[model samples]
Target: AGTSICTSEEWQGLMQFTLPVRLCKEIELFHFDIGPFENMWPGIFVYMVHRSCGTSCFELEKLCRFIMSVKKNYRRVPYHNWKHAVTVAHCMYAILQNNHTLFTDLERKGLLIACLCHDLDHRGFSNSYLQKFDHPLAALYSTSTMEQHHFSQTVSILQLEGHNIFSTLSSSEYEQVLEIIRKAIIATDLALYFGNRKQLEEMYQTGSLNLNNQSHRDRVIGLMMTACDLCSVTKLWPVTKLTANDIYAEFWAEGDEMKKLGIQPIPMMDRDKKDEVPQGQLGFYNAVAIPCYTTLTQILPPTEPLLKACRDNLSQWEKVIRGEETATWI
Candidate 1:
């Protein structure tokens, strides 16, 4: 409980006074860049939770402890660190800020919390690496190995003293929120996104996807998790490029370890294939982000900025692959 527990002063410090004027306003927009607010992230996270759930449901003190503990739980990995989790949460925050009417209050809370904890304790290794290497986490789950662990870690954090932000809820409501958090966290797995996409697309095309249906609600949340988890790609070019470099560092590190064990890493993970990165990112967007935003925009037109930013970045990446002079951000 070293840094996991925070004093009232510490909590207040986490909510620094000056940044909120800008943060409170910018957080509501998709184009809000987190780049400039480096050390102020914890305060920003606090604001995010408060804005999403409010203190009527949970004690602010408990929420602060919970957020700090969650941050402490994330490993110092290159990409899947605490800041990444908060960025995803901010994306969720931005989405809910305008689209709050689309979901139940409980769902809005669960989605934000799930995004905050989705990558807790991530070790910078892909699930495939963990599976092939027979890591203990792999042996525990069989599928969605890391995601199951992330959800488990989330539960553990909530169980800690002064960290159960949902303590005031009824037992049934507690169970519902926990279930939502579990499903949403698991939805961050890219492997599951494909099946989720197919199902949601089929329902939408068939004119049968009713947001009020529990099944449909679950599918929509799953896609939102993916879009938020991959939110870096939808950022302005410089921010997106820097994020890509950080991700590349983590992937290349994993690639090195796998190669040492006689496993061949994929081109995106392989340092020797640095030249393949442009095409790799292009393929990633075409296969994942493009279709993701395509369906997302179809379901909710308010998310147009997410798709627009994604496409803008995609063209920049495309320019690299095309061997043309890169266009500067206008």
Candidate 2:
């Protein structure tokens, strides 16, 4: 027997905070729909499996088993949920599929794996949380500590010493996989935000956007991977809205916790109540994310629609910021 779970529609309703509305009612009417079994898996795993294995039953089973093992071992937290991983993975997958001329199979596989496992055991807090609490992850790997820890954990799992998935690869192939994973995963750090954006923009400006050029392969792949990693704004309306809420919630929760413990919240995390939902997000998205992705999509046309959606979302948030719209309940 199989268990039922949320459909994309239901999930969207939940994120929109429509507790007992028409959509919710319809969702209940079709409650037994059970939806697709794959919906229960984190989105990241779905995309990774799809890209890497191409609907092969054996590959699906292996990927499913690996994801299950990781979930069983690591407690899910807000920032590190299967949802977040899969969101990143989907973004990466979208880039690869839509911009296929840019990436090799090896690069795509590495990007998927790296994005999926980048935060296998994140504790809901930022790197500062590790540093402040003297957590093992922090102390043991303090030099670029978070990425170091993430890579170590991911490798341990892949090596089959635990739930190794890459054990079948030859030495050369395995090393390439490792290299790509390391570069993509480590690039997720907030510290790399400006630098990554600069690099991506430079590439876009350099006419390196042509997908069919073999000489631009590495640069194009890097840009797509980085674009996916930074793709908070390019999501569809419902997912984009929920992701915004998640960001603010995490920041506020961390801030409150830090206050109780007499530690200062990280910069920008210390927003007053009046400045909550719209203020931070509006500025960040408009100033940073929107422009970054706009330039990115210009270079990589496949992402144009997503980029437009992001711009629209930003416009909606701007309304909220200016008191022109109400906040979504979530």
Candidate 3:
């Protein structure tokens, strides 16, 4: 319940949290140091899930191995770091647990896999950055662009000859699994925010419960994952503060990269030193994340805690922004 950033050494210990012996061995074999406490986000999330779901030793090991593999290859830098992934995964599990009756075992599996792999191969930049630079990811999938690239990569990895985790499933089951994963991963795109929220609103308004149908279930699961991805506004004070710091560091690095490339920094990224951290976070959270999560919870209900977390942390951020809080707080 108490959340603080973990140092690299501290993060390394997270492997012991609930990870299976084999998975722990794999992580250690990779020489995968936890990098930073912030980077331990995914491991923390998996730990939480293990705690709540009471996973088998085998399942726990499998999940841990999957997380470390995804983390190692995801190119997590700038915005889509382990922290953001872990935060989203945590929210996804929270939302599912909050609505326990609606999720099937397969649905839970899909949601976990989707949340863990949603931002795979993210290069710390937005789709806009990929497009502007003509990045291969952008060029490869021009429709949804970066999001499509992420999905393609995740699915490809899952289906790789030796690495297919779901290979034991029947064809129908495999298809269902892929469908759920695809929908959930694609939901992470910011561009899908409006359309996805609208669909959820429509589902709520229709007085039709669609959870029984696999496709409908997938759509709802997708909405939940997307909602969680944007639900940072609803965190506990300590967790929210840490998330804000993570976001600020990532955006600043991306801004620096853009500047070095002779590109005009994206909106707030162009700000002077004083306009960074606290001020930048204040503007982004107050304007974008808060309203997004507020509207989302109205339709989804389960996201209210995350919204409350955000609201509770707002004053703390205000103090930091006004220079009343110390640099450490910022």
Candidate 4:
């Protein structure tokens, strides 16, 4: 009762937050459609760790510290922020719960934390922008470059005082988790996902895919990471729409920033073509979202709930395209 309850102010704070009882009660029961998911991030993540890994008192306290640090490190942009991180984590949590047999226990833990850390410190810029602006992150690495940075920030958090959740792990188990986490971070690249998806599609279609098979396991984990990374599409309509807007808000904002630098923005990023929202939404679902779950549910039939629910959310976007849904936003 006492330890589980964090106050509302604490929920919004950068530090000194604990898990609230109400959030835990709701998080424990919820499977999906968690619209106000941003507020529930910390509590839900702690609950996930508590339920799965079984932490100690010290470990729990440090877990909160680690999460607070992770949250602090995320930029306050509209999307690709802490809320985005949590959404991805929630999706990973759902996948891990529904398909527990497909992941080793360590692999499950790796995916959970990897989802939380994959986009740490993003400047709201896409990988496509790496070459365009003589970007600050350009010299750092490329798409793969910022990815390694996120992994480094994740390590720094884990190293903080009272924040080493991996300290309790056996040496071998510790290395195992880190290795899987490294691979999972690599999975964040969409270029990597599409290439892997083509291979996975063939394997899945032929019925030759096997999670327990070592090489197959790596590819599936990458595919699963993309599933979590793009979880905004797999939500109920209201949440899905808001999530999409938040992302575009960040995208359009990045373009606005680029203009200040004298680089002309691309059509998708340009707010001048704000009315071009439907084009973006359509491409989002067809190119990535729907096809993602289609393959996912194919591999894990139990995840058909994801496929059906995502399709349900996508229908609302369909109405937007057909002019039946007039989203009145200024």
Candidate with the greatest TM-score versus the true structure = 1
lDDT of 2 at 274: 36
Which candidate gets the maximum lDDT versus the true structure? Answer: 1
Over 156-198, each residue of candidate 1 has an lDDT whose tens digit, in order, gives: 8888887898888889999999999999999999999999998
Query: What lDDT tens digits, residue by residue, belong to model 4 across residues 1-330?
Result: 011222335434523446666665545321364555556567677777666555552355556767777877888888888888887887777777777776777887778889998998887877766657666666776667678777877887777666687787899999988989888998888888788888899998898998778778898888888988887777766777777778888888878988998988888899899888887788778888788889988887777777787788778777887889855542
Name the regions of candidate 4 deviating beyond 4 angstroms.
Answer: 1-40, 56-58, 326-330
Candidates sorted on TM-score, descending: 1, 4, 2, 3
lDDT score for residue 241 of model 4: 76
* Clash pairs for candidate 1: none
Tens digit per residue, CA lDDT, model 3, 248-321: 66666777878888987865555456455666677767765666667557656765766666666677878876
The model with the greater lDDT, 2 or 3, is: 3
- Higher-lDDT candidate of 1 and 4: 1
Whichever of 1 and 3 has more lDDT, that candidate is 1
- The local distance difference test score of each candidate is 0.86, 0.61, 0.63, 0.76
Residue 275 in candidate 1, Cα distance off native in Å: 0.2
Clashes of 2: 2
Q: Write the per-residue lDDT of candidate 2 for residues 118-207, one digit (tens) a residue.
A: 776665677877788787777787755677777876776664422445655688987887987876777667566566566657766885
Provide the TM-score for each candidate, comma-separated: 0.94, 0.76, 0.74, 0.87
